[PDB]
Design a protein around this nucleic acid. Structure first.
Ligand SMILES: [Ca+2]
Ligand SMILES: [Ca+2]
Lengths: 163, 163
DNA sequence: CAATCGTGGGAGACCTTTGGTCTCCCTGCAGAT
DNA sequence: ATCTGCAGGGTCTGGTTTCCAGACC
DNA sequence: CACGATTG
């Protein structure tokens, strides 16, 4: 039936697959914030909750969210933001009535044969283009790799296969 | 006339002040989970949202939450967990209809004259017990300092003054 | 259970299969279109 | 706007605001 | 503050 896929980071996206095969994918809402006298991007909490409440996906629809797992070599700000984004999305999802299933990025990448690519973000958009050809126009730029990741997460949860 | 105060960390608490002067304070619900084959404590997202859904404070009540600001000498896991707790709480509060106001610890501490204390957690419990004497029995233990901080955040947002 | 202490730390899935091996982002900022 | 590369990083409030100083989990 | 441990 209905499946949600969430790529939670600041350039991420939420994809929504309906039972008739149609699909939506929305860039993650964000605002610009002053932190320690510079500008940072931070996810827009009220807009995310508004987006989720506007979905036609019925209550109880499963939302596959990519597990936050920053590298030990990522900096502490990277650890903080990935932590922050993950919690914001998990709480927004649970509160809006969806069942959250965290999925490791290795899990859906292996399902689609995408591990060890030397061009992983191009390949993700490529695979999402094939699974969702009406979204090909929305996946042409390299910055669209979060849209692809959300789409493939939902594709994984629905059990779609590449031809 | 209602004011909410949130200490968002794992040993934190939510305080709820009503216009008639009564007060409630709840320890933050948590669960034990497995991460990297060890046990960690993690905030219980479903119980937080159900707790907020059961409050009598109406929509549009302001919730004062302590701004997460970990120290650069804190480890990256501390950074992730403070980020996660913050985002979980903020989304939970926004989704339950409350208006979130982030407050730095230095702000409410300076307001109650608690800066540079040699026993900061004890003084917080003492200040909260004086502002909310009917919570005195709930502030007896050293580990109740999260209950105190949540109370003091809400007392700050309300504009209460120490005698 | 409650307190105290010292230092700041990956995590996950599956195989080789009760340990071993391999894999995975992200943020923040500058610089060049 | 788009991208690319590279290393992995505090942040906050109120002073004497034009940055400093001192403070915090 | 988290995290992982020991002490009371
Ligand atoms: Ca992503
Ligand atoms: Ca606290």
């Amino acid at each position: 039936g209905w499946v949600i896929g969430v790529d939670p980071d600041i350039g991420g996206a939420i994809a929504v697959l309906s039972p008739d095969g149609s699909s939506q994918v929305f860039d993650n809402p964000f605002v610009h914030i002053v932190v320690s006298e510079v500008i940072r991007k931070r996810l827009d909490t009220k807009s995310i909750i508004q987006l989720l409440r506007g979905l036609d996906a019925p209550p109880g629809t499963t939302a596959y969210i990519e597990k936050s797992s920053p590298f030990p070599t990522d900096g502490k700000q990277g650890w903080w933001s990935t932590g922050f984004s993950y919690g914001l999305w998990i709480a927004s999802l649970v509160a809006s009535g969806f069942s959250v299933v965290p999925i490791a990025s290795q899990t859906w990448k292996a399902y689609f044969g995408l591990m060890r690519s030397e061009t992983p973000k191009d390949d993700s958009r490529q695979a999402a283009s094939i699974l969702f050809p009406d979204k090909d126009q929305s996946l042409k730029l390299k910055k669209h790799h979060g849209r692809a990741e959300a789409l493939l997460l939902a594709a994984y949860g629905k059990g779609l296969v590449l031809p």
